[PDB]
Amino acid sequence: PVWKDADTTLFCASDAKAYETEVHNVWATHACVPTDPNPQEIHLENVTENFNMWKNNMVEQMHEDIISLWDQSLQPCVKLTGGSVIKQACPKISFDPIPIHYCTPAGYVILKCNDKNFNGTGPCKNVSSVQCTHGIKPVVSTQLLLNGSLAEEEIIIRSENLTNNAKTIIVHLNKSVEINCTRPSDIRKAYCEINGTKWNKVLKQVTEKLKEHFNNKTIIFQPPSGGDLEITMHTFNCRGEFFYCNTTQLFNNTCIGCNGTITLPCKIKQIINMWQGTGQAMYAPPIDGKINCVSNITGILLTRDGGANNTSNETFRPGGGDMRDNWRSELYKYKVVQI
Numbered sequence: 001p002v003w004k005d006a007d008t009t010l011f012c013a014s015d016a017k018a019y020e021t022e023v024h025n026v027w028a029t030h031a032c033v034p035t036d037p038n039p040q041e042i043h044l045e046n047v048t049e050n051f052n053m054w055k056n057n058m059v060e061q062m063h064e065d066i067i068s069l070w071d072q073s074l075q076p077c078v079k080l081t082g083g084s085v086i087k088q089a090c091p092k093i094s095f096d097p098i099p100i101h102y103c104t105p106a107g108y109v110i111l112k113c114n115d116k117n118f119n120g121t122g123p124c125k126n127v128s129s130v131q132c133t134h135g136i137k138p139v140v141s142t143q144l145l146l147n148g149s150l151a152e153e154e155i156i157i158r159s160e161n162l163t164n165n166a167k168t169i170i171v172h173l174n175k176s177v178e179i180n181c182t183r184p185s186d187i188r189k190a191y192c193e194i195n196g197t198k199w200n201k202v203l204k205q206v207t208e209k210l211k212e213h214f215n216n217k218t219i220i221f222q223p224p225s226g227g228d229l230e231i232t233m234h235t236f237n238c239r240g241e242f243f244y245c246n247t248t249q250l251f252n253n254t255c256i257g258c259n260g261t262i263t264l265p266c267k268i269k270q271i272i273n274m275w276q277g278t279g280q281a282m283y284a285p286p287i288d289g290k291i292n293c294v295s296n297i298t299g300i301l302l303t304r305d306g307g308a309n310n311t312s313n314e315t316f317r318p319g320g321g322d323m324r325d326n327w328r329s330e331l332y333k334y335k336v337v338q339i
């Protein structure tokens with residue numbers, strides 16, 4: 001009387017502090033339950049279970065959770081939706097994401113793949129059962145995945161279908177690389193500092209892996225080929241402020257004096273295209289003084305050029321935009337089943 005694949009409405013849990021005014025804490029205080037006081041992950045002896053991170057309903061559930069979070073929390077000076085414009089108060093908020101656990105209701109469990117080099121689709125030989133996922137931070141980003149978990153063995157390439165150039169590629173790193181972004185005390189001009197030595201080593205490793213998957217062809221990195229600034233720039237939110245950073249220096253191939261510190265030029269933007277697809281939002285100027293965030297680059301989103309089937313190269317560019325891949329990068333090893 002065991003299990004079968006099934007979709008069901010999950011709930012969430014967290015260590016949200018009831019006394020906090022930080023928006024993730026407020027949201028999870030009234031929309032999640034407390035973290036499981038006694039989590040028990042149970043190994044399944046001699047069991048093989050197949051997974052598919054690209055067809056996982058948990059992704060869509062988390063995505064709508066994060067949309068609701070942002071709709072309740074952020075307050076634009078003016079919002080631009082369709083034919084109208086709605087205008088309100090826009091005070092500065094406290095923004096800092098917290099881990100969110102996802103849990104099944106009665107008669108359901110989460111299966112978890114524990115095979116170290118599991119690429120996201122296919123069988124898994126080391127499977128356990130949990131009641132909740134681990135705490136996942138809902139980090140909204142582009143090009144680079146930040147503050148995520150790490151691949152435990154080798155760098156892993158995740159894709160629905162590597163031969164289709166339209167699908168997104170998720171590179172899951174086995175080594176954090178720090179990105180340290182500050183706006184010092186133009187108020188909107190800022191920058192991000194990255195270790196050149198470490199980054200170029202990791203990028204070399206990503207090229208060796210991509211070569212493994214693409215019949216030993218020459219791997220070339222290129223910047224995005226136009227589009228809105230949210231895709232052409234590494235875009236993220238640091239303590240309420242929307243950073244747009246130029247990553248051209250990260251995706252040149254020459255260091256694939258390139259063992260110093262790379263300094264990426266950034267700008268804090270007040271007017272953004274919402275990742276919700278819902279249009280345009282206008283915020284207030286940034287807080288006075290030093291605005292600083294130190295983050296772990298743990299993943300990379302990549303889109304591969306088409307039309308090079310008859311060439312000796314494959315060229316890749318930082319991608320993103322549809323946030324669901326961000327959640328996929330952390331939900332890949334989980335799946336709901338009905339008991």
Ligand SMILES: CCCNC(=O)N1CCC[C@H](C(=O)Nc2ccc(Cl)c(F)c2)C1
Nearest residue numbers: 140141142230235236237273275321322
């Ligand atoms: C393949 C997916 C294509 N994507 C899109 O067409 N769009 C619409 C316009 C830009 C949108 C966006 O990423 N906005 C954004 C906002 C704040 C932060 Cl912090 C951030 F990281 C991102 C996403």
Ligand SMILES: *[C@@H]1O[C@H](CO)[C@@H](O)[C@H](O)[C@H]1NC(C)=O
Nearest residue numbers: 043114115116125126127128
């Ligand atoms: C299976 O996963 C467990 C838990 O993550 C870990 O000890 C190891 O990777 C595997 N153990 C065995 C006995 O296969």
Ligand SMILES: *[C@@H]1O[C@H](CO)[C@@H](O)[C@H](O)[C@H]1NC(C)=O
Nearest residue numbers: 147148150175176294295296
């Ligand atoms: C960054 O990565 C290190 C290990 O690579 C980890 O100990 C640290 O907690 C990470 N930072 C964040 C904010 O997750």
Ligand SMILES: *[C@@H]1O[C@H](CO)[C@@H](O)[C@H](O)[C@H]1NC(C)=O
Nearest residue numbers: 153154155156174175205209
């Ligand atoms: C990370 O993965 C690469 C293979 O993708 C491997 O060569 C390297 O040794 C790994 N590093 C660590 C610290 O495990």
Ligand SMILES: *[C@@H]1O[C@H](CO)[C@@H](O)[C@H](O)[C@H]1NC(C)=O
Nearest residue numbers: 119120121122157158159213
């Ligand atoms: C993951 O494994 C399956 C076969 O076991 C395959 O369909 C898929 O291409 C693999 N992923 C990668 C990145 O090779």
Ligand SMILES: *[C@@H]1O[C@H](CO)[C@@H](O)[C@H](O)[C@H]1NC(C)=O
Nearest residue numbers: 160161162163164165166167
């Ligand atoms: C992958 O994509 C290519 C071209 O986009 C398509 O011809 C092929 O059938 C796809 N493979 C799978 C397994 O869906």
Ligand SMILES: *[C@@H]1O[C@H](CO)[C@@H](O)[C@H](O)[C@H]1NC(C)=O
Nearest residue numbers: 178180181182193292293294
């Ligand atoms: C980040 O950079 C700023 C200035 O560039 C520096 O003051 C700060 O100590 C750095 N943080 C870390 C963790 O290295």
Ligand SMILES: *[C@@H]1O[C@H](CO)[C@@H](O)[C@H](O)[C@H]1NC(C)=O
Nearest residue numbers: 194195196197198259260261
């Ligand atoms: C870069 O990382 C190396 C470790 O490989 C470290 O020794 C070095 O100090 C770092 N450089 C900078 C500028 O952070």
Ligand SMILES: *[C@@H]1O[C@H](CO)[C@@H](O)[C@H](O)[C@H]1NC(C)=O
Nearest residue numbers: 210211212213214215216217
């Ligand atoms: C890639 O090259 C290595 C040696 O560099 C070779 O052993 C392997 O067969 C090649 N693989 C492909 C898919 O071309």
Ligand SMILES: *[C@@H]1O[C@H](CO)[C@@H](O)[C@H](O)[C@H]1NC(C)=O
Nearest residue numbers: 223229232233246247248249
């Ligand atoms: C990023 O910087 C390069 C020069 O380093 C510049 O040519 C390019 O136009 C910049 N990207 C954008 C979107 O402005």
Ligand SMILES: *[C@@H]1O[C@H](CO)[C@@H](O)[C@H](O)[C@H]1NC(C)=O
Nearest residue numbers: 146147236237293294295296
């Ligand atoms: C990543 O985590 C660190 C430590 O919790 C935090 O200071 C930083 O702002 C986070 N980065 C993002 C992009 O949220």
